[PDB]
Amino acid sequence: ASRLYTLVLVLQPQRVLLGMKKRGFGAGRWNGFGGKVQEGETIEDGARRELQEESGLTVDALHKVGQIVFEFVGEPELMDVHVFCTDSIQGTPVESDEMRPCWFQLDQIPFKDMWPDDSYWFPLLLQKKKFHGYFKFQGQDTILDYTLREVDTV
Template sequence: MKKRGFGHGKFNGFGGKVEEGETILQGAHRELEEEAFVTTPELHRVGLLLFTFENDPKALEVHVFLTKTYNGEPKESEEMRPEWFSYDAIPFDTMWADDKYWLPILLQGKRFVGRFDLKQDQSTIIKEELKAIDTELPSEWEL
């Protein structure tokens, strides 16, 4: 559960912005440790998503990582309150609107790429494009 900032009040994965001088992978490791107090020896990039918001010139590029192992016990931080859900009880109604599209693909063990255009309310999807892929993910978007 995201406790503050962008996505406040929604169940969300751990993550955030990449800091100057670090790679996307390094940022993912750092955010996991900062937000849940756990580390992992491996993160696998399984998804690449682009988000646009109505009347906002900036797009968000989101890299989705997966791990099946971690060190430590997840704990609540100032940013997040970790909570576990079984696959049949995922609370999509309290998550980002796009999660119900791509999370099932991830849970099937597939990689994916997609784009979601949202209204200003950040909840209503205007348009979505999403596909599971069998190849490596592109390193960046070609816009």
């Protein structure tokens, strides 16, 4: 079985917003905003909730840009991450207990301090291409297997 997660990338024409994860899973890496989808909310509502909780931001619209499935060796549950993009933020980003937000120019994206899979699929996001991904991890550092392709419908 898989568990539903969200990931939101605030992508403007010359910069992208990332958050430094301060605690919990993936702490110490820059990432998009998101988390587990809860009972009683749609996937998109979950993505909005997490963006709000983690950055203080609300948005007009969220666009579906990809799905990535993660397997971690030894872990029963797969992560089914629904990836969204926006360029219509409302408010100014503010630090939360979970995330410290910062803007990065698109040629200074800090891949060495991000999840290793981002190096593979960010280019597709940046090129406004819809994708499906699968990544098999050994721990949090080592990609054993992956697949990646462009799709018409996410």
